[PDB]
Design a binder for this molecule. Structure first.
Ligand SMILES: CSC[C@H](NC(=O)[C@H]1NO[C@@H]2OCC[C@@H]21)C(=O)N[C@@H](CC(C)C)[C@@H](O)C[C@@H](C)C(=O)N[C@H](C(=O)NCC(C)C)C(C)C
Length: 378
């Protein structure tokens, strides 16, 4: 076992991603690996770095094999190259197994590792199709399901505020969410690609073309902090959120994520910021459901030192050229099930949820929505 053992096995720093503990090689070297659903490559720093307090020493693993190949992985921000090998891997606070998994040893990286982040590697939980340099490179989870009896499914429970959560590998832990799970189809098994059929702000429809929401694509990426929207959608929402908050004033560099906002501690005017409702395509015909986001999610907190401590937040909705990204701020407060087996993603209200005083982040269905297929971009 056991699910209770995997609960609370993620840790993080705010806006710095969630990591889990893994071991690589024999004898086992323990490293903190960022859980990333927007990528398909298992990689760790194998070289010294100013931002790393640990790294993978293949020289110290009787089990390391070399694929005599090199790889380069770009991300929306940050990139790295290294040497492909295969070693033995285990998750201390996950299923009780060890598997031979492809591993990229990171030899050189730009804008990838984070100063003070406690993670020295990344675990791409998406599919092979987006693996580098090709789908030949079985991704970790594929290896794990192919070499064990771990079911082909995992759920992520990302709790905010430093920060922690749970990664239940191979099942659903029912003590971690309330209500019922709602499922949206994985449109295609490359990214975790979902179809957003409608968007509402404070109960008002943005009334854009369904396609605009998934222009390029929409994905669930635990590895991206913000909620990232296509240009057109993004602009619409900012306009909407601005109007909802015109009572106060902020630099338009705030809405760009550049500047910061602070209020006298415990004085945050949550009420003037709206809720955002994302309607995801459902499991039956003409059926969808919605998840509702509180400003406590897209207003991310960031500590600043001041003669008065205050409460400071960064605007956590960013413009995108790669499609919509349902990042960690969206995933926080929900229990998200990556049902790779039944080709779907389920959402429920997390046990560790947002808890506004007069508003609740919710998962609600059923909703009827016609021509939902017309929302996928082609
Ligand atoms: C400026 S947008 C922020 C996002 N990273 C972050 O927010 C983070 N910065 O510090 C923290 O680390 C993770 C969370 C925090 C990011 O850009 N990128 C990555 C997370 C990092 C761990 C490398 C990925 O999760 C993004 C993911 C969608 C991705 O880029 N996947 C690649 C891709 O699809 N395309 C490559 C791209 C240049 C077109 C792989 C599949 C190869």
């Amino acid at each position: 076992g056991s699910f209770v053992e995997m609960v609370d096995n993620l840790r993080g720093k705010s806006g710095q991603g969630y990591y889990v503990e893994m071991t690589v090689g024999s004898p086992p070297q323990t490293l903190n690996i960022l859980v990333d659903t927007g990528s398909s490559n298992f990689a760790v720093g194998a070289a010294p770095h100013p931002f790393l307090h640990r790294y993978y020493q293949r020289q110290l693993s009787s089990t390391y094999r070399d694929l005599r190949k090199g790889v380069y992985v770009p991300y929306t921000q940050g990139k790295w190259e290294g040497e492909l090998g295969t070693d033995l891997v285990s998750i201390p606070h996950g299923p009780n197994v060890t598997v031979r998994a492809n591993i990229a040893a990171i030899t050189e990286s730009d804008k990838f590792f984070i100063n003070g982040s406690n993670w020295e590697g990344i675990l791409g939980l998406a599919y092979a199709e987006i693996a580098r340099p090709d789908d030949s490179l079985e991704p970790f989870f594929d290896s794990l399901v192919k070499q064990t009896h771990v079911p082909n499914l995992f759920s992520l429970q990302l709790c905010g505020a430093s920060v922690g959560g749970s990664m239940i590998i191979g099942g659903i832990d029912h003590s971690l969410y309330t209500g019922s799970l709602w499922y949206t189809p994985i449109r295609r098994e490359w990214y975790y690609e979902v179809i957003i059929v409608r968007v509402e702000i404070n109960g008002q429809d943005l009334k854009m073309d369904c396609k605009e929401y998934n222009y390029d694509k929409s994905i669930v990426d635990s590895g991206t902090t913000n909620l990232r929207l296509p240009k057109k959608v993004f602009e619409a929402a900012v306009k909407s959120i601005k109007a909802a908050s015109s009572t106060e004033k902020f630099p338009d560099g705030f809405w760009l994520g550049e500047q910061l906002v602070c209020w006298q501690a415990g004085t945050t005017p949550w009420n003037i910021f709206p809720v955002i409702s994302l309607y995801l395509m459902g499991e039956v015909t003409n059926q969808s459901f919605r998840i509702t986001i509180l400003p406590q999610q897209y207003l991310r907190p960031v500590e600043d030192v001041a003669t008065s401590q205050d409460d400071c937040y960064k605007f956590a909705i960013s413009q995108s050229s790669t499609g919509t990204v349902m990042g960690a701020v969206i995933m926080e407060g929900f229990y998200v099930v990556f049902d790779r087996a039944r080709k779907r993603i389920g959402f429920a209200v997390s046990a560790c949820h947002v808890h506004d005083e007069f508003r609740t982040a919710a998962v609600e269905g059923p909703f009827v929505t016609l021509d939902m297929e017309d929302c996928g971009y082609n």
